[PDB]
Design a protein around this ligand. Structure first.
Ligand SMILES: Clc1ncccc1Cc1nnc2cc(-c3ccnc(NC4CCOCC4)n3)ccn12
Length: 349
């Protein structure tokens, strides 16, 4: 029989064996395994999306995007397993090289040296530079999606929430609401919920930096609307100028009705942190998304000057365009597209 992990069948034999639980989500589970053919340890992400259009969209995007990415700081896809015919396909298994841990687990057991924080942050932004150069938004950057080895190599994973946004088109009003994980959500995800940009990823990285500095989430909102109150509790109330940049009248009136909060100085929250790290943190956690530092400027910041080197920081040679966005289709058509995108890993073809 096929191996089972916590009640989930993993139909990945005979090539992949010795499965161990790593984690799970609403419609998927990840296990470690052994690749008997290449004699290497792998992670396998089982995805079962086909009953819901949104799940199918996210499965197709993760596959299409990662199959076209090749970058040292981004998890690669080794192999994709699914049934030989579309009717039998209920699950898709994405196979990746196995990393030792993630940043979420590391921060449970270790206080990081400034050198480790600096080097980890560089690698995050080095991978993000490549992602953003491809016109992709990751939209769910957080410690558990940053994979780590003992060599301190870092790789970004889980592109289930990622998508392409062709800059030739205005995506205002067409972007999915309620993206990112709550504590890592930029304010405009709540105040401009269908019209944010790739700068929400920079905000997430800022939340990650703060978490590396103190081993605690900086904005641990208890529910969706509580999240904005945590953000404003530290940044203080938005300036008049920043307010009048919120185009949504409803969101702008909601903000005008909040009680005034003063800014908490960064070095009061992080009194032992590198002042350069706090300066970069401040620019990444900037309320106004258009004033927020962009990925290349973040790499060029004094905090990262031991590592910044554009001659060794690849960008995408064919940035993605609208063709990568054609997924507002019935889930039955998306299943056909997923079948086609994964056909290159099938015997025959
Ligand atoms: Cl968990 C989950 N479940 C359902 C949906 C989404 C997700 C999140 C998610 N997506 N892709 C992935 C990939 C991986 C992965 C890839 C390579 N090496 C390792 N090594 C582990 C070993 C134990 O320590 C943590 C690192 N993990 C992890 C989570 N991943």
């Amino acid at each position: 029989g096929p191996e089972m992990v916590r009640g989930q069948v993993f139909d990945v034999g005979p090539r992949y064996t010795n499965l161990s639980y790593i984690g799970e989500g609403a419609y998927g589970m990840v296990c470690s395994a052994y690749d008997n053919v290449n004699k290497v340890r792998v992670a396998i992400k089982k995805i079962s999306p086909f009953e819901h259009q949104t799940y199918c969209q996210r499965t197709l995007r993760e596959i299409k995007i990662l199959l076209r990415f090749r970058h040292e700081n981004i998890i690669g896809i080794n192999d994709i397993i699914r049934a030989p015919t579309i009717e039998q396909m209920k699950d898709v298994y994405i196979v990746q090289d196995l990393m030792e841990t993630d940043l979420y687990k590391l921060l449970k057991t270790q206080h990081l040296s400034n050198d480790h924080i600096c080097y980890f942050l560089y690698q995050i932004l080095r991978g993000l530079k490549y992602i953003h150069s491809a016109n992709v938004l990751h939209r769910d950057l957080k410690p558990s999606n940053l994979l780590l080895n003992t060599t301190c190599d870092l790789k970004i994973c889980d592109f289930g929430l990622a998508r392409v946004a062709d800059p030739d088109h205005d995506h205002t009003g067409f972007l999915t609401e309620y993206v990112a994980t709550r504590w890592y959500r930029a304010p405009e995800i709540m105040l401009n919920s269908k019209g944010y940009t790739k700068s929400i990823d920079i905000w997430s990285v800022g939340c990650i930096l703060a978490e590396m500095l103190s081993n605690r989430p900086i904005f641990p909102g208890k529910h969706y609307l509580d999240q904005l109150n945590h953000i404003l509790g530290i940044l203080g109330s938005p300036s008049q100028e920043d307010l009048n940049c919120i185009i949504n009248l409803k969101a702008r009136n909601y903000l005008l009705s909040l009680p005034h909060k003063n800014k908490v100085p960064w070095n009061r929250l992080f009194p032992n942190a590198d002042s350069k790290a706090l300066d970069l943190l401040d620019k990444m956690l900037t309320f106004n998304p258009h004033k927020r530092i962009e990925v290349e400027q973040a790499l060029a910041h004094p905090y990262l000057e031991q590592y910044y080197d554009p001659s060794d920081e690849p960008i995408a040679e064919a940035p993605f365009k609208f063709d990568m966005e054609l997924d507002d289709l019935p889930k039955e058509k998306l299943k056909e597209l997923i079948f086609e995108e994964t056909a290159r890993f099938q015997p025959g073809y």
